[PDB]
Structure formats: C-alpha cells, structure tokens
Design a protein around this ligand. Sequence first.
Ligand code: 8KK
Ligand code: CA
Ligand code: CA
Ligand code: CA
Ligand code: CA
Ligand code: ZN
Length: 316
Amino acid sequence: ITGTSTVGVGRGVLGDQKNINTTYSTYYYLQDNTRGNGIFTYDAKYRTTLPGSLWADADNQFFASYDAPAVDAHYYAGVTYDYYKNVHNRLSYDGNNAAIRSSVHYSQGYNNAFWNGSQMVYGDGDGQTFIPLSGGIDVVAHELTHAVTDYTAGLIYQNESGAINEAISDIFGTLVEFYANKNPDWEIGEDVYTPGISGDSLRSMSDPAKYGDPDHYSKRYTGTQDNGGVHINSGIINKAAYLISQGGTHYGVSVVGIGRDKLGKIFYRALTQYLTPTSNFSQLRAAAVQSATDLYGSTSQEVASVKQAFDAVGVK
Ligand SMILES: CC(C)C[C@H](NP(=O)(O)CNC(=O)OCc1ccccc1)C(=O)NCCCN
Ligand SMILES: [Ca+2]
Ligand SMILES: [Ca+2]
Ligand SMILES: [Ca+2]
Ligand SMILES: [Ca+2]
Ligand SMILES: [Zn+2]
C-alpha cells in the first residue's frame, strides 16, 4: 500500500519485544519499506486461501496473542533479507529485490510451514507438536531459502536433488540463526517444537541420527515416503556441512573445521554457480569442491576439508 514508513513495537511468539517496520495509511500495516521492494505480512485468518489480507493494526502496537506470529514472520524475514544482502550480496530471493510475502495463521492446528512457489506460509501448530512456526528464526530462514533455491539451482523436490534442496534450507536457516546470534545451534526448529519437551528439535545437523535421520550415505532412505525422503536424507548433507564448519571424526574419518562463514561462502557459491535442478549428492560434492577451489585455491585447507567431510558421510 502507499503510505509513510513507521516503526511499531510488539511481542513475538516467545514473548520477546521487538520493533517492526510498518506503513501508515489510515491503519498501520505490516509492510516494511526499508528492505528491497518491501516485506509484507498477511493474516490468513485460520483459512487456507492465500495470501489473505495484508496485516492491519489500529495503533502500531502488536502485543496481542493473535499478533505474535505476524510480528515474528515479519521481523525474521527482515533478518533473513539482511543476511543474504550483507553476507552474500544477494538482493531478496530473486536477486532483484522481489517483494517478500508471508501469511500467518494458516489453517487450523497446522504443524508445518512452506514456500508455495510465491510466498511463505506458517501454521500455528496444534500447541503440542508445534507452537506458531514463525517463532523460529531457523524456520523462517529455511522457508525463504526455498525461494532462493527455486530461483537459482532449481533443485527438484524429490530424491537426492530434493534432499539437497532441504539441506540447503537447513544450512542457511542455521547460518541465519547464527547471524542473529540469539541462542544459536546446529538444531532445526527447537524454538517452536514440542513446548512440553525441553532440549529436542525437529532435526539435528550435528547428529542427524538423534532423530532417526541418516548420517552416512550407506544409511540413505530409498522408499517413496516424503518425496523420496527429502527431510530424511537431508541428514547426510547436513552432517557434511556441520563437519566442514565445526570439524570432527565421523566413522573414523577426521575433518578439520573451517568455520561457519567459509561453509556459507562455499555452499552459496555451489548453489548459485554449479548446482542444477537434477544434481545428486555426488554432484554436490563436486560443486562444493569447485566452489572452495574458486574461493580459496586448489591446495587450500578449505578444499581438503570439503573432501574429508564428504568422505566422512560416504559421498564420493
Ligand atoms: C523447518 C520446518 C519447521 C518446516 C519444514 N517445512 P518445508 O520443508 O518448507 C515444507 N515444504 C514443502 O513441502 O514444499 C513443497 C511445496 C511446493 C509447492 C507448494 C507447497 C509445497 C519441514 O521440515 N517440514 C517437515 C514437516 C514438519 N512437520
Ligand atoms: Ca494494536
Ligand atoms: Ca537456537
Ligand atoms: Ca536452530
Ligand atoms: Ca521442545
Ligand atoms: Zn524445507
């Protein structure tokens, strides 16, 4: 909407106060004009028709329980925008400052979030398995990263290409979580998962097997559930990424860690310069090796560590 840029205040899903960029024109709207061609947050009103209505508020204060998922979807989309721009020189998901749109309060009891080809969508959860999913910065960044992937490598959402697609979203979701630097970890979704159980998460990148996901190619799933295991076999790549950054010895193979920033540079370059819609795990290894070679040199520790990490998870 046309209006003037304003700054509102509210509380997110976890009860934390934050400022949010809004737009005033009769109402205050969740429309942040400070980033690209805007970040826009919508109310889906417990229904499944998208996007719903651009979020309107009478007083620019967002402290109602119903407001909390919108506050966080809007704010964390801004953080994710900032990460891609400041760290990777990428302007929004399409590289040309496309408007970023999210809808919250999608459906009833909806234990998921997704990119629908055009926008992000967040359930409220059922209160037992999930609370409103925009409360997780790693979740928000996971969803926006699906848009980045779709505009770049275009990884098809099934089998190995789809597991790479998933891992890319978990990797950058985690790197955004570290960028914001509030309780960062290598776990996925911990801030919104199972409010009655402490210390768990939906997936672990440091130890995928903690939740039954493979940490070695010899343990890959090859059935048909979950689009051929896209959220399962992602553990193999998540583990490789974790090892590149943090190091370790895994199934007897030692990996020298090179840190998160270099992990992010290598995988961003692989995603945007070398991967294609049908890339498999072996082709990802080659893409990451070439990316590290471009950035750091063929004789570098960074290249050597990429090779050891993929060796450690059984990907040649
Ligand atoms: C990070 C977690 C919290 C959420 C994540 N959701 P996602 O991967 O983005 C689910 N996207 C998905 O299916 O895209 C396919 C698709 C394409 C076009 C239109 C619609 C959909 C996930 O890991 N879901 C697994 C189940 C959670 N109960
Ligand atoms: Ca209000
Ligand atoms: Ca965390
Ligand atoms: Ca996390
Ligand atoms: Ca929990
Ligand atoms: Zn995903």
